[PDB]
């Protein structure tokens, strides 16, 4: 039982672990897409010049 | 000096059409940075 609260304790602290790796990936993601928008309307914008 | 007899010009001029538009561009720029340091620790009452 004691090993048992133990190693429940140390997995939930891996589960908080992924949690925040998965929000971290899905926000620079996110940023990235943003990035990618902007250089493409600099190039339209020179054309539209 | 080339004109006709009611003045119009008898020759085409050009200009040499100035250089398209400009393109200008940012970057990200890093700096070195470091991390803290440890000093000695001290010794509490309790067990580990």
Same mark, same amino acid.
């Given at each position: 039982?004691?090993?048992?609260?133990?190693?429940?304790?140390? +997995?939930?602290? $891996?589960? *908080?672990? /992924?949690?925040? #790796?998965?929000?971290?990936?899905?926000?620079? &993601?996110? &940023?990235?897409?943003?990035? !990618? =928008? #902007? *250089? *493409? /309307?600099?190039?339209?914008?020179?054309?539209?010049? | 000096?080339? =004109?006709?007899? &009611?003045?119009?010009? =008898?020759?085409?001029?050009?200009?040499?059409?100035?250089?398209?538009?400009?393109?200008? =561009?940012?970057?990200? +720029?890093?700096?070195?940075?470091?991390?803290?340091?440890? !000093?000695? /620790?001290?010794?509490? $009452?309790?067990?580990?």
């Amino acid at each position: 039982p004691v090993m048992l609260e133990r190693t429940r304790n140390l +997995v939930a602290q $891996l589960t *908080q672990f /992924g949690t925040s #790796l998965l929000s971290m990936a899905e926000h620079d &993601d996110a &940023d990235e897409l943003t990035t !990618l =928008l #902007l *250089q *493409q /309307g600099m190039e339209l914008a020179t054309q539209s010049i | 000096h080339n =004109l006709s007899i &009611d003045g119009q010009p =008898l020759s085409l001029a050009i200009y040499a059409e100035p250089t398209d538009p400009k393109a200008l =561009l940012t970057s990200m +720029v890093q700096a070195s940075q470091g991390g803290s340091a440890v !000093l000695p /620790g001290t010794l509490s $009452l309790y067990r580990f």
